[PDB]
C-alpha cells in the first residue's frame, strides 16, 4: 500500500528539490506551491505500535528514496538512487525505514536505522532538509501531510 503526498513543516515551509540528491525547505506563495516535492509514502514491515508506524519515503517523480547513513560518523539524511523496478518493497532495507509518529495533529519521521534522530528543517529560509537529533529546540521535526489526488 502506497500514497502520494506533499509534506510541509510546522512553520508552513514547503519542501523543494535543490540538487540531484538535495531537498530544501522554504515558504512558497500561491501559484509557486506547484514546486513542492511529491513524496511516495509506502507502509513497510517492521516494529509496529500505537505511537509508531513504519514507512518508506520515495520521491515519486524521481528514482530516489530518503535514506539514513553515517557521514563523518554522524547520522545523515540522504537521497539514494534506486531501481524503480524493484521498489517499493514490503520488507524495506533499514536505512530507508522511518517511524511515522502522530504528535499534536502533526507528523514526525524518526529514523529506524538511528532512533531519536528525525527528518528536520531549519528555522531559516532555504536551508537543506536534514536528520536532526534534537526534539523541541532549534530544529523543526513536525510536519503536515497534504494528499495529491
Amino acid at each position: 500500500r502506497s500514497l502520494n503526498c506533499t509534506l510541509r513543516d510546522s512553520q508552513q515551509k514547503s519542501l523543494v528539490m535543490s540538487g540531484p540528491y538535495e531537498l530544501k525547505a522554504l515558504h512558497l506563495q500561491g501559484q509557486d506551491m506547484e514546486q513542492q516535492v511529491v513524496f511516495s509514502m509506502s507502509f513497510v514491515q517492521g516494529e509496529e505500535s500505537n505511537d509508531k508506524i513504519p514507512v518508506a519515503l520515495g520521491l515519486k517523480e524521481k528514482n530516489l528514496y530518503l535514506s539514513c547513513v553515517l557521514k563523518d560518523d554522524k547520522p545523515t539524511l540522504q537521497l539514494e538512487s534506486v531501481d524503480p523496478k524493484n521498489y517499493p518493497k514490503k520488507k524495506m532495507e533499514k536505512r530507508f525505514v522511518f517511524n511515522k509518529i502522530e504528535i499534536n495533529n502533526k507528523l514526525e519521521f524518526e529514523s529506524a536505522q538511528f532512533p531519536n534522530w528525525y527528518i528536520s528543517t531549519s528555522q531559516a529560509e532555504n536551508m537543506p532538509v536534514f536528520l536532526g537529533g534534537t526534539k523541541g529546540g532549534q530544529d523543526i521535526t513536525d510536519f503536515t501531510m497534504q494528499f495529491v489526488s
Partner: antibody, heavy 118, light 108 residues
Framework: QVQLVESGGGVVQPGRSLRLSCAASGFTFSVYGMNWVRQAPAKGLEWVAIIWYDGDNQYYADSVKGRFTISRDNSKNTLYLQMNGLRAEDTAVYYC???????????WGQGTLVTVSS | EIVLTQSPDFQSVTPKEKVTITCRASQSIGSSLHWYQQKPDQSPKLLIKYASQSFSGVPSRFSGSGSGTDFTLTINSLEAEDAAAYYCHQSSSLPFTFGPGTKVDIKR
C-alpha cells in the same frame, strides 16, 4: 505571463568561446529551475544543462561537461550559458527552458542560433 | 545515461484517425516521461507531463499512457495542424535525455 527571451547567439570560431543569456519574466524566477536545451539544424532535441532555483547546484549533459557552464542571476532574472572549447558539433539553436519540479520543460524560449565555424 | 527509443521515426496517418507513438526507456523511469510537440519554425511545447497528465492549454485529443519502461502518446481524431515532430523526455534521473523524435504526416 511567462516569457523567456534568449540573446548572444552568433558566429564563433572552433576552439573559441561564446556567452548566451536568457531574460525571464511572468513568474517567480528565483523558485524555478532553468535549463538549456539544444537542437542542431534538421536534428532532434538534446538537454544541455540545468541550474536549480537558488543557483547553488548545476548538472550537465555528457556532451558539454567540462566545457560549458550554466549560471543565473536572480536579482536580474537572467539565465546564462558560458560555452568554451567549441567544436563544429555544437552548432545548434539553443533554447532557454523552465522546468516544473525538475521534471517537464513547461515553458520554452524562442531559441538562439550558435554557428561554430571558421 | 537512460536511453530513450522512440517508435516510429515517421508515421503517415489518415485524418480523423488515431496516431500511436511509443517511447522506450533502457531503465525503469516510473512515471517521469514527458511529451513535446514541435511544429515547423516553432520552439517545442509541452503536451503531456508525468506520462498521463495533459498540460494547461493542451486539447483533450492528446493523451499519454505508460509506466516503467514503455510509454505511449496517442493523438485521437487527427487534424492537419498535428503534422509536426513529437519528442519524449525522461526526468527520473540525471542526465536528462530525449527520444530521437517522431514526424507525423497527415494522409490527404
Amino acid at each position: 505571463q511567462v516569457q523567456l527571451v534568449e540573446s548572444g547567439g552568433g558566429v564563433v570560431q572552433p576552439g573559441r568561446s561564446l556567452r548566451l543569456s536568457c531574460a525571464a519574466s511572468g513568474f517567480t524566477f528565483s523558485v524555478y529551475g532553468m535549463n538549456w536545451v539544444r537542437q542542431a539544424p534538421a536534428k532532434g532535441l538534446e538537454w544541455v544543462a540545468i541550474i536549480w532555483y537558488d543557483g547553488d547546484n548545476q548538472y550537465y549533459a555528457d556532451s558539454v561537461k567540462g566545457r560549458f557552464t550554466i549560471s543565473r542571476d536572480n536579482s536580474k532574472n537572467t539565465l546564462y550559458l558560458q560555452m568554451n572549447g567549441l567544436r563544429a558539433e555544437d552548432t545548434a539553436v539553443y533554447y532557454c527552458a523552465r522546468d516544473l519540479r525538475t521534471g517537464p520543460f513547461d515553458y520554452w524560449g524562442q531559441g538562439t542560433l550558435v554557428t561554430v565555424s571558421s | 545515461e537512460i536511453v530513450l527509443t522512440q517508435s516510429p521515426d515517421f508515421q503517415s496517418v489518415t485524418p480523423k484517425e488515431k496516431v500511436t507513438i511509443t517511447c522506450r526507456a533502457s531503465q525503469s523511469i516510473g512515471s517521469s516521461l514527458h511529451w513535446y510537440q514541435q511544429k515547423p519554425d516553432q520552439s517545442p511545447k509541452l503536451l503531456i507531463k508525468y506520462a498521463s497528465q495533459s498540460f494547461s492549454g493542451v486539447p483533450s485529443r492528446f493523451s499519454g499512457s505508460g509506466s516503467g519502461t514503455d510509454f505511449t502518446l496517442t493523438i485521437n481524431s487527427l487534424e492537419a495542424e498535428d503534422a509536426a515532430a513529437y519528442y519524449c523526455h525522461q526526468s527520473s534521473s540525471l542526465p536528462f535525455t530525449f527520444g530521437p523524435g517522431t514526424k507525423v504526416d497527415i494522409k490527404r
